[PDB]
Each structure stands twice: as structure tokens, then as C-alpha cells.
Amino acid sequence: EFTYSYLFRMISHEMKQKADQKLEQFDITNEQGHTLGYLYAHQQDGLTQNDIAKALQRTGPTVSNLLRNLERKKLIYRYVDAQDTRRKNIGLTTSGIKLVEAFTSIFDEMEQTLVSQLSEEENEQMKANLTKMLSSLQ
Amino acid sequence: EFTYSYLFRMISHEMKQKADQKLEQFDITNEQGHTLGYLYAHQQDGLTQNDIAKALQRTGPTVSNLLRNLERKKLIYRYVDAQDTRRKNIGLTTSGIKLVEAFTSIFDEMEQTLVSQLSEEENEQMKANLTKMLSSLQ
DNA sequence: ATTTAGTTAGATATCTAACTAAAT
DNA sequence: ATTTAGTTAGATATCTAACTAAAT
Numbered sequence: 001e002f003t004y005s006y007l008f009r010m011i012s013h014e015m016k017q018k019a020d021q022k023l024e025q026f027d028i029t030n031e032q033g034h035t036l037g038y039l040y041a042h043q044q045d046g047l048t049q050n051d052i053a054k055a056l057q058r059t060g061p062t063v064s065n066l067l068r069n070l071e072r073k074k075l076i077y078r079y080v081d082a083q084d085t086r087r088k089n090i091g092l093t094t095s096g097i098k099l100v101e102a103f104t105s106i107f108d109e110m111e112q113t114l115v116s117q118l119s120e121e122e123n124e125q126m127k128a129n130l131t132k133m134l135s136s137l138q
Numbered sequence: 139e140f141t142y143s144y145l146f147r148m149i150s151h152e153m154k155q156k157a158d159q160k161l162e163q164f165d166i167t168n169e170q171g172h173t174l175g176y177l178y179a180h181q182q183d184g185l186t187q188n189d190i191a192k193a194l195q196r197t198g199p200t201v202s203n204l205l206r207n208l209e210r211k212k213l214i215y216r217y218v219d220a221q222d223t224r225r226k227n228i229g230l231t232t233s234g235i236k237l238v239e240a241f242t243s244i245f246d247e248m249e250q251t252l253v254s255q256l257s258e259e260e261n262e263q264m265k266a267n268l269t270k271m272l273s274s275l276q
Numbered sequence: 277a278t279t280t281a282g283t284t285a286g287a288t289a290t291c292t293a294a295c296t297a298a299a300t
Numbered sequence: 301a302t303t304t305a306g307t308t309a310g311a312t313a314t315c316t317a318a319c320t321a322a323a324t
Contacts, residue, residue: 004252005153005172005245007268010195012150013314014275015143016289020315031289034143049306057148062290064306069288086298086305107143114142117274118267125260126267130145133255137152151290158291167312188281200314202282207312224281224322 004133015110022106026099027073033103035066036075039092040100047090048081057138075099142271153248160244164237165211171241173204174213177230178238186225187216213237 019030028036038055039047053063067090070076075096078088092100115123157168166174176193177185191201205228208214213234219225230238253261 001265002269003245003249004265005157005249007265007272008146008150008153009172011268011272011275012146013195014272015146017315018275019143029288034147050304057151058289059291060306061292061308064308066289068307084299084305088306107141111141111143113274114271117270122263122267126264127140127142127145129256129260129264130142130149131140133252134145134149134152136251136255137149137156155291169313186281196313197315198282199284199316202284203313206283219281222281222323226282 019106019110023103026103028075028099028103031066032070032075033107035070036092036096036100037104037107039076039090040097040104043091048087049090052090070096157244157248160247161241164241166213166237166241169204170208170213171245174208174230174234174238175242175245177214177228178235181229184227184229186219187228188225190228208234 016030019033023030023033026033035052035056038052042055045051049063049067050060052067053060056063058066067076067078071078073096074093077091077093081087081089118126154168157171161168161171173190173194176190180189180193183189187201187205188198190196190205191198194201205214205216209216212231214228215231216226216228219227256264
């Protein structure tokens with residue numbers, strides 16, 4: 001019986017935490033895992049950073065910064081697109097695809113373990129309640 | 139239909155942002171708000187930094203860092219505990235107490251604005267399930 | 277012995293304000 | 301001659317590694 005500030009704060013932090021530990025063996029952070037994971041799914045769209053910035057609900061610098069790390073790992077690649085020299089377009093590298101195929105399990109577990117804690121009727125109402133709340137902030 | 143991670147992750151983040159913007163009034167960050175708020179509530183006990191870490195579920199360095207930020211602002215003061223010289227007792231300065239008394243509405247404002255989004259039973263379920271999901275992540 | 281309490285410093289994530297590089 | 305894409309400055313928060321100092 002606590003504050004929503006407390007609850008959402010704690011839960012979120014412990015997911016970054018639990019997931020940071022499991023992701024250790026791949027030398028990435030959860031944020032990095034998620035971005036990588038995102039790129040696995042939607043790179044078909046000739047992705048550019050703003051697009052990612054938009055998808056991750058994070059700022060332009062924040063994303064610039066994360067991508068830079070990932071490219072230092074050579075986990076991704078930014079060809080400076082042709083129509084614009086400003087635009088860098090983002091995609092995985094085999095090494096990054098290999099990585100994604102390899103850690104994706106971790107994310108899936110936590111989800112399942114979570115959605116194991118409840119029954120289908122709950123998860124839909126619960127997850128559908130969550131969505132509603134997120135919007136109100138956003 | 140979103141993965142739980144996305145939801146907690148996004149929700150907690152914007153809460154920080156909404157809270158952070160509103161607090162801009164007071165020259166403090168969302169976390170500083172929460173820490174001072176705790177200090178205001180439990181100050182009498184009286185807390186060591188490690189007490190704060192446990193309550194806030196944070197590592198020792200992280201608390202050490204925030205407290206210093208709060209100390210710089212002159213909103214808390216700390217001194218060495220006389221019996222156990224290891225410890226530093228943390229307390230709110232008079233300035234800090236007033237500051238809390240000022241900003242507390244915001245935290246309440248946001249908690250309500252969330253609560254106002256569901257039925258009393260829907261909220262009852264919500265907060266209840268969340269505790270369990272929190273628990274399940276240790 | 278070993279556990280506790282706190283600091284410091286290098287990473288990453290994040291931010292806003294402000295930059296440069298370059299397309300309109 | 302002007303937005304617009306991406307980066308940098310420097311701030312907070314967070315973690316671990318590494319430390320010191322102290323208690324049990």
C-alpha cells in the first residue's frame with residue numbers, strides 16, 4: 001500500500017538492475033540492449049537517429065550518446081546517408097545481430113516471470129491500466 | 139499491448155521529467171525531492187546515510203553523492219555520530235524544512251492525478267499487483 | 277577476522293542549452 | 301540566409317571498483 005512514485009520508481013530501477021547483471025556477460029547495459037533490440041525489429045525502415053530518439057522517448061543528445069557507445073563496440077553502423085550529409089542511418093552489424101539474438105532471451109524471461117505473477121485477466125487490465133497512466137504523463 | 143519493461147521504463151522516466159520540470163521552481167531534482175521528503179518524515183530517528191540508502195534502495199556511493207548535492211545547497215547538514223565514529227547523521231536544515239513544506243504539493247499533485255485515472259477498486263488492484271511485481275524482483 | 281560506514285573516481289544514462297556541419 | 305541533424309558542455313543520477321577508517 002504505497003505511493004505510485006515509489007512503486008514505479010522501485011520496480012523500474014530493479015528491472016534496470018536485474019537486467020544489468022544478466023547482460024554483463026555481453027558487456028552491454030539494459031538501455032543498450034533495448035536499443036540494439038529495437039534496431040533488430042525496425043531497421044528495415046532505413047532508420048535515423050531522430051527516429052530512434054522518438055521511439056525510445058529520449059532526447060537527441062541522449063540518443064547520440066548511446067549510439068556512439070554502441071558504434072565504439074562496432075555493434076552498429078552509421079553510413080552517412082547520401083541525400084543528406086547530416087543524416088547518419090543506423091543498422092546492426094553481424095556482431096550486433098549476433099549479440100541481439102543472444103541476449104534477447106534475458107528480456108523475454110523477465111517479462112514472462114512478471115506476467116507469470118498474474119492471471120491473463122489481470123495482465124490485460126493491469127497492462128491496459130499502465131498504458132492509460134503512461135499516456136496521462138506523456 | 140506493451141511489454142512490462144517498456145511500460146515501467148517509460149512511466150518512471152516521464153514521472154521524473156514531469157516532476158523535475160515542476161520542481162524547477164525549487165532548484166532541486168526529482169530525487170532530491172524524494173530524499174528530502176524522506177528526511178523530513180524520518181529525520182528524528184536519526185538517520186545515517188546507510189539508513190537512507192536502504193530506504194531509497196540505492197548504493198552507498200549514490201546516496202553519498204546526492205547528500206553532498208543537498209549539503210551544497212545547505213538543505214541538509216550532517217555530522218559525525220558520537221558513539222559510532224563510522225557514521226554521519228543526516229538532518230534537514232531550517233531552510234531544508236521550509237523547502238520540503240513548499241514542494242510537497244507537487245508530489246501529491248502527481249499521485250492524485252494518477253489515482254484519479256482509475257476506480258477505487260481498479261486502484262486497489264493496481265497498487266496491489268505492483269507490490270507483488272516489485273517483490274518478485276527482490 | 278570480517279563486516280560496517282562513508283568517499284572518490286571512472287563509467288553510462290540522462291538532461292538542457294548551445295554548438296558545428298550541412299541540407300534547404 | 302536559413303532551418304535541421306547530430307554533437308558537445310557540463311550538469312545529476314546511478315552503478316561498481318577501490319579505498320579508508322572504524323566497529324564487533
